Amino acid sequence: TKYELKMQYFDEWMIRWRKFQTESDWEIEKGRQWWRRFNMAVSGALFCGLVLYTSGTATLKRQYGLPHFFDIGVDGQAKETMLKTLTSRWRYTPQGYGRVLITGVPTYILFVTLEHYRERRRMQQYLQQNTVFGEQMRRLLSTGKIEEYLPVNIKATLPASQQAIYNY
Amino acid sequence: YNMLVFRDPKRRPQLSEEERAKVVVNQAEWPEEFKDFDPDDPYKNSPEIIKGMSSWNLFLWGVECAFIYQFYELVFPKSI
Amino acid sequence: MFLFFFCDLFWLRLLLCMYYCVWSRLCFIVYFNCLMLIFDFLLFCLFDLYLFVGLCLFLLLWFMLFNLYSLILYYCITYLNLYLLFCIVFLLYIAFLFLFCFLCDFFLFNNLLVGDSFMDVFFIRFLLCFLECFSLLCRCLSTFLRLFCNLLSSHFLLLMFFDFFYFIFVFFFYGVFCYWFILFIFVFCFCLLFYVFLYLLDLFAAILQLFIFCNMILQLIMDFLLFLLFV
Amino acid sequence: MLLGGFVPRRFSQFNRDPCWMFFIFSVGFWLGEYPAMMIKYNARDLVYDPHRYVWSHHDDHH
Amino acid sequence: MQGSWSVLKKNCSNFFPGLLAFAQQTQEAYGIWLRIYNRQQKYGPTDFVEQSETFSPDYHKRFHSQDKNMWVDKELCTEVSQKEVARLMTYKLDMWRMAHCAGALLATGGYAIPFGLFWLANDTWVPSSFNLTGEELRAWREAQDLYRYRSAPSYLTDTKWHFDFHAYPWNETQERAWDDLFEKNDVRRDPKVVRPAAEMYDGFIKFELIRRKSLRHLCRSMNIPTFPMLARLCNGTRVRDYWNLAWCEDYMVITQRLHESMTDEELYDYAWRRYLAPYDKNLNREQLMERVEDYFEFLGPDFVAHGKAPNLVILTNYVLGYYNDPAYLEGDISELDKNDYDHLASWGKDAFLRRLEFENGPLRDQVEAHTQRLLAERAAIAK
Amino acid sequence: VLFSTYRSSRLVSKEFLHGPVMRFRALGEYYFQRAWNGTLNWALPGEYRLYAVMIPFIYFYHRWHNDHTLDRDHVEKAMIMRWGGTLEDVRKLSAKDQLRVRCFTDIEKLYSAYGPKDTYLQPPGDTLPGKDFYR
Amino acid sequence: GELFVRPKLEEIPPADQCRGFFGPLNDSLKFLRLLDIKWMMNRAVAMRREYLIATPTLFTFIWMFTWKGAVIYFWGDRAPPRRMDWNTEETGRLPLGFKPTPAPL
Amino acid sequence: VGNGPTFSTGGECMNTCDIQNAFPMNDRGVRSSSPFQEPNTAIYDSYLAWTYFQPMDVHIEKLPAPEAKYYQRHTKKPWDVSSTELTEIQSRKKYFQTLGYLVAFIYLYFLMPKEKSFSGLSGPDGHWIMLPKGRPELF
Amino acid sequence: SNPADHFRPNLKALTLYAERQHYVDRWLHVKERWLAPWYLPWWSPLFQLGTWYSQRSRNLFLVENHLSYRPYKFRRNDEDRNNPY
Ligand SMILES: CCCCCCCCCCCCCCCCCC(=O)OC[C@H](COP(=O)([O-])OCC(O)COP(=O)([O-])OC[C@@H](COC(=O)CCCCCCCCCCCCCCCCC)OC(=O)CCCCCCCCCCCCCCCCC)OC(=O)CCCCCCCCCCCCCCCCC
Ligand SMILES: CCCCCCCCCCCCCCCCCC(=O)OC[C@H](COP(=O)([O-])OCC(O)COP(=O)([O-])OC[C@@H](COC(=O)CCCCCCCCCCCCCCCCC)OC(=O)CCCCCCCCCCCCCCCCC)OC(=O)CCCCCCCCCCCCCCCCC
Ligand SMILES: CCCCCCCCCCCCCCCCCC(=O)OC[C@H](COP(=O)([O-])OCC(O)COP(=O)([O-])OC[C@@H](COC(=O)CCCCCCCCCCCCCCCCC)OC(=O)CCCCCCCCCCCCCCCCC)OC(=O)CCCCCCCCCCCCCCCCC
Ligand SMILES: CCCCCCCCCCCCCCCCCC(=O)OC[C@H](COP(=O)([O-])OCC(O)COP(=O)([O-])OC[C@@H](COC(=O)CCCCCCCCCCCCCCCCC)OC(=O)CCCCCCCCCCCCCCCCC)OC(=O)CCCCCCCCCCCCCCCCC
Ligand SMILES: CCCCCCCCCCCCCCCCCC(=O)OC[C@H](COP(=O)([O-])OCC(O)COP(=O)([O-])OC[C@@H](COC(=O)CCCCCCCCCCCCCCCCC)OC(=O)CCCCCCCCCCCCCCCCC)OC(=O)CCCCCCCCCCCCCCCCC
């Protein structure tokens, strides 16, 4: 299922009618932002791990060998530990297109999958909302069209000092 | 010579004085356009493009066109 | 908002098509230095140091078709806008800078830290590095600003002088038939002299400005080129 | 580049080349349009617009 | 070669049999590669196995070093035969092109189908397995040769122009080698004369310093897909692997003299994989043997003695010089009796042209003498 | 397979419009393909006659465009603003009156920064209409 | 300007020789090397790793000259006003008696 | 002799150019304007000096026609386009481009009105596009 | 003023106007039409290129909580400094 094609209209409408954004919807969007950052972080960690695993033995020896920039003693211990751990076993160390694929395809797949399912999660969250945004989301998934000026049609709540327009 | 910024090109001599002195000039073989040829006025005998059309006539033609351009609306004005 | 307009080069495009359907040699180039970067033999560069020749030639042709012909009255410089020139210089300068940065060679920037180890790193060398990194962007800005300001000032001066000459020529030539004719003849001769001087100055300045414009870009390129010696 | 070509020695020779014929025609236009403006815009019967103080470009640009 | 409907029909008909054959070849080639890779990891030098880093002296960019990152397995004949190595090389080419096509399909989903129609209409980028008969294989080889002809001259000109513009040979022998290296294929180059160019260019650009544009030209000439090119260390890796396999097979053949016992078609294929023998030249066994022997001589005694081949850039230029055909010249010499500027005859000569003809014509000496005498008289009168 | 990427795939015969094309090339080549026609970066030719012909032509067509398309807008604005504020009001005048008004606009242009300032500044005590005449 | 050759392992001075803002951060002060920026700069210069100082600067400038400069100009948050228009959190909620449409099922 | 052009020079003097050795020198000491041998090459001095070659009627001992085998090379390829064919193609293309540019120039500078006129007698004042249609729910 | 007015393009032909909402919506419809078919899976790079950056930017707009007021981009009058409305 392709949720982005449905959700782009809803997001544009929300931006156009952001005045009726309750704090719950704002929290939903903040959670989406946080999960995007988390997905980026984990995908980057996976990419770094794949790059390190596929790195050449000479490359690792140069990177995790002498000299030590700080020379505190913990730095050398950590570098030696990582170097021994990597160089102990045999590692498949491709170069060129192969390393590109091995390092990138898993990262792209992970990031895309996480983001897609978080988009589905956000769609469900907006479906469960009891606000005008949630009603718009439900109407969008039902009729397939975004109904603009919905907040003023169904008379969504307004501040006490702005209810004169509804006075009819 | 010059006409404003346009300078007339001049051919560089190629013969030495000794060789040049031995050259016999026979203007009878020269074209009628270039006889008594003068580097300072090579086109004095050059034919006109249009017979009877002087440079002053063309200058005056332009002057008359300018006068028409400025005075036609004085005799045949048109409304907005 | 979408404005549909046309450049002022259509007649020149027609002339280019007419006069360049057949081949011709080119032996005079406004900025020849883009073709000769290396002067000591046996030196060679692994970087594509001649990539700028084509863009340089096209830019010279375009800017010449506009700026040089703008001396003819009522000819329009269609691109004469500050931010449009900013876009042009941004394209060229940032493209070459990103070409050097995509190389992923950080040692290339070692020369940014100005000075030697004797100088204090935090209070002298680092501040010089900050100033030099600022100076790169300032060089881009100054290039486009110089090109814009020179054209604008030159054409403003030409317009004002032409207006004055039209005024005195039209409304004070009758003095030739009067007893103060010598004053008018002196003024008219002075105006002719200033007219010729202004046109010559603008002709020289346009070509010089294009030369400087291309020289700035080539200087950006040269600041990061490293030459190997053949053995 | 101003390298070469036909260069008339004096006025009378401008008619020896079609291009210079067109040039001298254009020069005639250029120089003769000024006397015409002298006659037209310094005329006795030329009258300033009575409503010239109703509007001016100075108002608009200010 | 350009696309055609007949080739489109051929490749559409043989699409699925070709895929099945490619899969079988993939299994076989994986087995062969596994044997070779195990042998390389076990018996290879420490630098080769550990993938020692060689950086350029100007921008410190890593690239494969011919001495350290390439290794000729002299004892590979025990585990892998010559025919298996040839099979692996052919499969590597086919697999590269198939991999690029599969990547395009995965990237663009179902929008790659029309581009697939463009792809099957040309034999340039289809695998060899798509040809099920001799005539189809011949046409496919013709397409490969055409691509090689299209691409090689640019590579050769790039190398020659950059060197000649930025450097010169040191001694006369190097001058002769460099000049004779880039001769057209209609003349026979003596490998002994041309070999010193390898060292001369090693002084200029080793394989570790090869530029990205030159690499693109080389990969085009080797029928290696170049889009997306990406970093130069990907197609460079492909080139290194292909020529490492080629050198292993070459050592096997030279040591065991397999080429003498090699049959005609197999010998032609062996030369073709070295970019020595186009199929459109219709070479016989004598010519093929001459070219192969010249290639072995160019490799030199040091190749057998230590497994060290000459500079790879110069080697590629030498072998690709066989695809540098003489510049075409068509038309009878009588065509030189015509005129090119008859359409201008109606215009005649203007005053300036007449003056130039008069001053620079057969009467030029007389005009010069008259003009100089007149000027001298005027100068004397002025003084 | 649909379209060729090579320029060698011809769409017409070699002799298509040979005559007109040769006349066009003769026009192009006669003055330009000469030793003294050495250009500066393809923009400034060496032949004098090219300047002599092209500078006047460029000026002429630019001036025609400026006079009949660009300055006409300012002229019409002055006519409309000074004589009613509407096009119909201007059209109520005769062609001679419009000629007078337009020529006064030309006068203002020719003075510009040097002419008398009484052409647009009303001196105190002047009896002519002011700015609030039509308001 | 000229070609750069990385120093050999023996040509790199010891870490104890490097100086911080006030003085060398030798034994009993090694862990302060992580926090002293000037000590890290001096160490980088000593090890010929000057790029660590130069690369982050230039790139940052580029990042500001290219992408963040315009983002701040067009979408940045200006200084808040004195009298602030806080949100009463009354807008958005559906009115009483409204029958929302059912969710997908 | 005809009025046709010769090998292009670019307005350069070959006796002082950077590639002067590529141009043969005649008896008079004037380097040719072309790779060919020229007997009557000259130099003209405007602001800048330039070399000029005047075509003339000269007889040259013509070596007899060789056989086609020894000068024809049948290595033509599908992508190959000869210089003569390229000249033909470009001539036709530039002819049509010149006609089109001529029509464009005439229309632009003599027929096209300027937009947004003060009087409203010429040119458009602009209008909106991409307006919604058949979307009642949009309002 | 008058000299400054010489520095304008001289060949303006036509001006067209379009609301940002309208053509953004039309572009979204085109993108949905071309990214809808089944033979373009959601995990393909093309689909993500089309959708992810737009989704991220719109989310950033929605999450925005600014203490200052940003005047409407398409007001009738944006030349008055003392009137953001
Ligand atoms: C190779 C190229 C070379 C040539 C370069 C040429 C160009 C010149 C260079 C300069 C650039 C010029 C500019 C050109 C335009 C380019 C586009 C552009 O500028 O867009 C900016 C544009 C700016 O955003 P925006 O549109 O303005 O919107 C602003 C919002 O913030 C947007 O919000 P959002 O929702 O999108 O989220 C964005 C988020 C992005 O970040 C995230 O999403 C989260 C983090 C992502 C991490 C990614 C992976 C990193 C590695 C993971 C770990 C690996 C190791 C694993 C093993 C470990 C073993 C122990 O950032 C934030 O919001 C900030 C969050 C920070 C949280 C800090 C919390 C505090 C604790 C942590 C910090 C302090 C630690 C102290 C420790 C002290 C110890 C003593 O886009 C972004 O920056 C965000 C989107 C892209 C993110 C990509 C993430 C990866 C970046 C690369 C990392 C690796 C390379 C760098 C290191 C290299 C070393 C060799
Ligand atoms: C529609 C999809 C859209 C995709 C978007 C994503 C971007 C495009 C994707 C990929 C496109 C295809 C082509 C990519 C480039 C290919 C390059 C190439 O040919 O490499 C060959 C090369 C193979 O050659 P090799 O001989 O095997 O090895 C290379 C040699 O070592 C070479 O030897 P060498 O001598 O050259 O050694 C030098 C080498 C050494 O490096 C390597 O070669 C090793 C591999 C790279 C390692 C990178 C990680 C370094 C450590 C990061 C630490 C970060 C800590 C942060 C902590 C934060 C905590 C809060 O290079 C470096 O030193 C460069 C280091 C990187 C510097 C980065 C500087 C960035 C400055 C940022 C400026 C500011 C940004 C904005 C502001 C942000 C913040 C607000 O490939 C690799 O090595 C790995 C290639 C990886 C390709 C990328 C994979 C993409 C995966 C995408 C996942 C996410 C998708 C998101 C989609 C979103 C929705 C649509
Ligand atoms: C609603 C009212 C109508 C308007 C609708 C507009 C819709 C807009 C949609 C929204 C767009 C938003 C974005 C707009 C951004 C604009 C930016 C801009 O303008 O930047 C300035 C910038 C200025 O550039 P420039 O430096 O002046 O150079 C561009 C020039 O085109 C010159 O450059 P170049 O010379 O390098 O160009 C190459 C040139 C190379 O040279 C040539 O090929 C020479 C010819 C040049 C033609 C082009 C110049 C046009 C000159 C002015 C118009 C000519 C007269 C038209 C007469 C109209 C009469 C009413 O070749 C061509 O032009 C190829 C086309 C040749 C066509 C030949 C046709 C032959 C037909 C023969 C038929 C025979 C039938 C016989 C039947 C017999 C039966 C018995 O403009 C551009 O870069 C182009 C902007 C275009 C943006 C796309 C607009 C969408 C397409 C609209 C098409 C409308 C077609 C329907 C009209 C129907 C009549 C009403
Ligand atoms: C579903 C999600 C999809 C994601 C989106 C993908 C979008 C498209 C991007 C391209 C994806 C790959 C396409 C298929 C390629 C075929 C498989 C393959 O690798 O072929 C080997 C071949 C290896 O090339 P090489 O130059 O010889 O490699 C040098 C190595 O040293 C070679 O090593 P060696 O010398 O030691 O020899 C080893 C050799 C020895 O083997 C042999 O000799 C036997 C043959 C083995 C290979 C056979 C390949 C057959 C290819 C054709 C397949 C049939 C097509 C049929 C078409 C018609 C269908 C009806 O075996 C290999 O070739 C192994 C290479 C390493 C494995 C690479 C695969 C890694 C990715 C897969 C795992 C993903 C797991 C996800 C987990 C998720 C976790 C969260 O691959 C290529 O030709 C490279 C691909 C060429 C196109 C490049 C396009 C740009 C790529 C940019 C990617 C950036 C990151 C992704 C994000 C992009 C955003 C913009
Ligand atoms: C069922 C099958 C099996 C399953 C599938 C298997 C997988 C299949 C897929 C993989 C296949 C791979 C192999 C493919 C090989 C063939 C490739 C190819 O195309 O060859 C050329 C191919 C012919 O090949 P060939 O004859 O065999 O010659 C090959 C030679 O070896 C000559 O070779 P060459 O090397 O000389 O040619 C190379 C040439 C290839 O190119 C071409 O040849 C160009 C082809 C197009 C020419 C179009 C000319 C005609 C234009 C007409 C315009 C309209 C006219 C008016 C129409 C009016 C209609 C009413 O150049 C290139 O390679 C350039 C590549 C450029 C790459 C661009 C990358 C852009 C990246 C963007 C920047 C990103 C930066 C990073 C940003 C990151 C930000 C985070 O060209 C054609 O056949 C032309 C087709 C033209 C079609 C009609 C015109 C277009 C129609 C469009 C319709 C649109 C409808 C929708 C409209 C909707 C409006 C709202």
Ligand SMILES: CCCCCCCCCCCCCCCCCC(=O)OC[C@H](COP(=O)([O-])OCC(O)COP(=O)([O-])OC[C@@H](COC(=O)CCCCCCCCCCCCCCCCC)OC(=O)CCCCCCCCCCCCCCCCC)OC(=O)CCCCCCCCCCCCCCCCC
């Ligand atoms: C006079 C006026 C006429 C009209 C003018 C038209 C207007 C033009 C204006 C502007 C033109 C310039 C624009 C330049 C932009 C900047 C370029 C740049 O930065 O390049 C960097 C760089 C330069 O390229 P390169 O790889 O170094 O070499 C380029 C040489 O040309 C390689 O040459 P080579 O000799 O080394 O190799 C020759 C041969 C060698 O043969 C091979 O290698 C074997 C065959 C390879 C097949 C392809 C394998 C692909 C593998 C995966 C690639 C990565 C995928 C990433 C994920 C997907 C992202 C969508 O390769 C080929 O023949 C390539 C065939 C490609 C055919 C397609 C060309 C485009 C035609 C238009 C089709 C698309 C129309 C869409 C719009 C309309 C929609 C209605 O590009 C790359 O790194 C390549 C990355 C490719 C990423 C995928 C494409 C991204 C763009 C979005 C695609 C959207 C698809 C939409 C589908 C339909 C939706 C409805």
Ligand SMILES: CCCCCCCCCCCCO[C@@H]1O[C@H](CO)[C@@H](O[C@H]2O[C@H](CO)[C@@H](O)[C@H](O)[C@H]2O)[C@H](O)[C@H]1O
């Ligand atoms: C492959 C990885 C798969 C991961 C699967 C899930 C792992 C288990 C859940 C991880 C933890 C989730 O818990 C997560 O906590 C953070 C706070 O830290 C919450 O985040 C909340 O508070 C933070 C505080 O800064 C706010 O910025 C954010 O807007 C708000 O949503 C997330 O809404 C919640 O999802």
